[PDB]
Design an enzyme around this catalytic site. Structure first.
Site, PDB file in Angstrom:
ATOM      1  N   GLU A  15     -17.038  37.966  31.444  1.00 29.47           N
ATOM      2  CA  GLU A  15     -16.645  36.585  31.515  1.00 29.47           C
ATOM      3  C   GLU A  15     -15.347  36.338  32.274  1.00 29.47           C
ATOM      4  OE1 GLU A  15     -14.449  34.894  28.033  1.00 29.47           O
ATOM      5  OE2 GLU A  15     -15.265  36.548  26.984  1.00 29.47           O
ATOM      6  N   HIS A  67     -16.015  25.965  25.069  1.00 30.67           N
ATOM      7  CA  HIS A  67     -15.560  27.138  24.357  1.00 30.67           C
ATOM      8  C   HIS A  67     -16.666  27.826  23.526  1.00 30.67           C
ATOM      9  CE1 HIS A  67     -12.248  28.974  21.836  1.00 30.67           C
ATOM     10  NE2 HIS A  67     -12.175  29.486  23.039  1.00 30.67           N
TER      11      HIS A  67
END
Lengths: 110, 89
Positions: free
Chosen positions: A73, A102
């Site tokens: 990520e 998130h």
């Protein structure tokens, strides 16, 4: 500084060059340089860098798992201060997904 | 620093996520899921962190034993170098 930090910018680079832009360091590399997260000081100890490259474990199994495929990520849209909620997620076989909340939902973008 | 999770009042796994949030002074954008807690723990939270989870087996049954996987994320975080002390009371 050399910065590429947008969802399309980083997505196209990962697809083309199979590597993240050079303005990304991992949390670990940043912690070593003096980054302590609660101070929100990435820009002082590593100007122009963003957090990116770390393994993503895909803990809620929201993204396509398969044997042999690792996920990783990186932060998107970061400049300075405290981190935000935008992330890009890329696999070893180059699937690309993104999250702006998130990690609650993820959109396949390539 | 010292945060106390009482596993008696943890109705569900969302309940837990709200408590972790106000107790560890997590981001307002917090995504209330495990990927999100991992990132908050490796990239937001102040250290030293000491987490007291009182009454864990109750917590587990109530949370359909999903409290264990959020306990696992604090352990993993600690193995990566985070200054977290877990006190299973």
């Amino acid at each position: 500084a050399q910065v590429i930090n947008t969802f399309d910018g980083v997505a196209d680079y990962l697809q083309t060059y199979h590597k993240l832009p050079d303005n990304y360091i991992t949390k670990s590399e940043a912690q070593a340089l003096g980054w302590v997260a609660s101070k929100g000081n990435l820009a002082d100890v590593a100007p122009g860098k963003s957090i990116g490259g770390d393994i993503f474990s895909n803990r809620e199994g929201k993204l396509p798992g398969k044997s042999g495929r690792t996920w990783r990520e990186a932060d998107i849209n970061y400049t300075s201060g405290f981190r935000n909620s935008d992330r890009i997620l890329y696999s070893s076989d180059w699937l690309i997904y993104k999250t702006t909340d998130h990690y609650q939902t993820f959109t396949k973008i390539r | 620093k010292k945060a106390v999770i009482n596993g008696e009042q943890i109705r569900s796994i969302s309940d837990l996520h709200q408590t972790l949030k106000k107790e560890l002074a997590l981001p307002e954008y917090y995504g209330e899921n495990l990927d999100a807690l991992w990132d908050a723990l490796t990239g937001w939270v102040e250290y030293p962190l000491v987490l007291e989870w009182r009454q864990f087996e109750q917590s587990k049954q109530l949370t359909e034993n999903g409290a264990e996987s959020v306990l696992q994320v604090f352990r993993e975080a600690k193995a990566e170098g985070a200054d977290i002390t877990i006190i299973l009371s």
